[PDB]
């Protein structure tokens, strides 16, 4: 008997991140009695991606879950799939100016709070903390800071030290960390709002001879970050839950389909234990 088909278009079809997404997508599909077709370019490409979307629309599949490779570039195709009664869910990357039925991605405010909880677990409730923030005006990093700040203020007496990042010409993370640590003699921890900031902060903490005098909490799982964690340099990193993003996206599609009609995901914490 024929099951509804959901198309999942990834960033890269070989990327393990997106294979985690596929596995979760498949789990929900199996639970909901649907099948998932996993598509995606070999090379990151708005054109390859848009072509896959077009075929999915033409084949009148029951729903489309897609990665947005460039904002603005997807609003026409999405709104046209939606017009032909195909529900569309954007995943990891959003096309917010569209009729996307839902966006599935990390709850950045929450991810900030989890970072706050972990930092208090690392250094206690008194002391000083500073934020290393690559994009001062980037929404997801603003959200991480907001979550982090709210948690810290509500659950500790940690003072959050502010640093203007202007010099540094809107600033490389190694350079801004030098400034934070050179200006302030009693910084107990750094909170890094992106993956690169974590790598830069860790290098600067090492170069200024403050390893294990200054704890570091960051985002994302790059090799260097995981290596820094095994090595006592970085205390924890906050990681996205790919599998669950794929899982949630299928369930949202199937809900729209079966008329039962959100939608941000949790994160995990990796400290020295779970580095394996």
């Amino acid at each position: 008997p024929i099951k509804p088909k959901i198309v999942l278009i990834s960033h890269i079809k070989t990327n393990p991140y997106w294979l985690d997404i596929k596995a979760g997508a498949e789990r929900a599909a199996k639970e909901r009695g649907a099948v998932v077709e996993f598509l995606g370019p070999t090379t990151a490409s708005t054109e390859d991606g848009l072509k896959l979307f077009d075929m999915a629309t033409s084949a009148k599949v029951s729903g489309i879950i897609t990665y947005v490779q460039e904002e603005g570039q997807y609003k026409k195709k999405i709104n046209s799939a939606m017009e032909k009664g195909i529900p569309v869910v954007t995943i990891a990357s959003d096309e917010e100016d569209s009729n996307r039925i839902a966006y599935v991605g990390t709850d950045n405010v929450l991810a900030g709070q989890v970072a706050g909880k972990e930092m208090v677990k690392q250094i206690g409730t008194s002391g000083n903390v500073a934020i290393v923030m690559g994009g001062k005006n980037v929404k997801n990093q603003k959200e991480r800071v907001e979550g982090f700040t709210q948690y810290i203020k509500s659950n500790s007496n940690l003072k959050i030290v502010d640093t203007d990042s202007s010099d540094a010409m809107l600033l490389e993370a190694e350079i801004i960390t030098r400034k934070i640590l050179n200006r302030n003699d009693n910084i107990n921890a750094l909170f890094c709002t992106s993956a690169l900031d974590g790598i830069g902060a860790a290098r600067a903490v090492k170069d200024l001879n403050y390893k294990d005098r200054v704890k570091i909490i960051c985002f994302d799982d790059l090799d260097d970050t995981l290596s820094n964690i095994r090595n006592g340099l970085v205390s924890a990193t906050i990681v996205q839950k790919s599998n669950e993003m794929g899982y949630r996206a299928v369930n949202i599609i199937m809900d729209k389909i079966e008329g039962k009609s959100k939608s941000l995901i949790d994160v995990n914490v990796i400290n020295k234990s779970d580095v394996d």
Binding site: I2, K5, T57, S58, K60
Partner: protein, 121 residues
């Protein structure tokens, strides 16, 4: 077994042949190719049907996508024709025109996928 591959290529050819006639008609205006175009999609449509009454559990999915893609093709090619016949300019049906051939090649992609499948024991 081979019959199954055979008819897939007939399907693919009928779609190909339909698009050829469809292009020529939009360019030239010859009313004979417009009807050839419609003969070919019917035969395509028909032969996809026969493949479907004996579907695997696997290729029934390819076949549904193929059948639906053809329908999309049919729809955009008839909107292209519709616009052209109350004489709108090329800039006002360019959009269904290329869609028609884009979608025509999609049908071709499913056709090959369908045939690779029919390689089986």
């Amino acid at each position: 077994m081979l019959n199954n591959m055979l008819i897939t290529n007939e399907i693919k050819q009928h779609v190909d042949s339909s698009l050829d006639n469809f292009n020529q008609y939009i360019l030239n205006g010859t009313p004979s190719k417009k009807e050839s175009y419609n003969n070919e999609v019917i035969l395509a449509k028909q032969k996809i049907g026969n493949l479907k009454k004996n579907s695997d559990d696997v290729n029934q999915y390819i076949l549904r996508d193929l059948d639906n893609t053809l329908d999309s093709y049919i729809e955009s090619s008839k909107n292209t024709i519709s616009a052209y016949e109350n004489k709108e300019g090329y800039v006002f049906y360019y959009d269904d025109f290329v869609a028609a051939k884009n979608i025509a090649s999609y049908c071709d992609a499913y056709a090959s996928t369908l045939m690779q499948n029919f390689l089986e024991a």
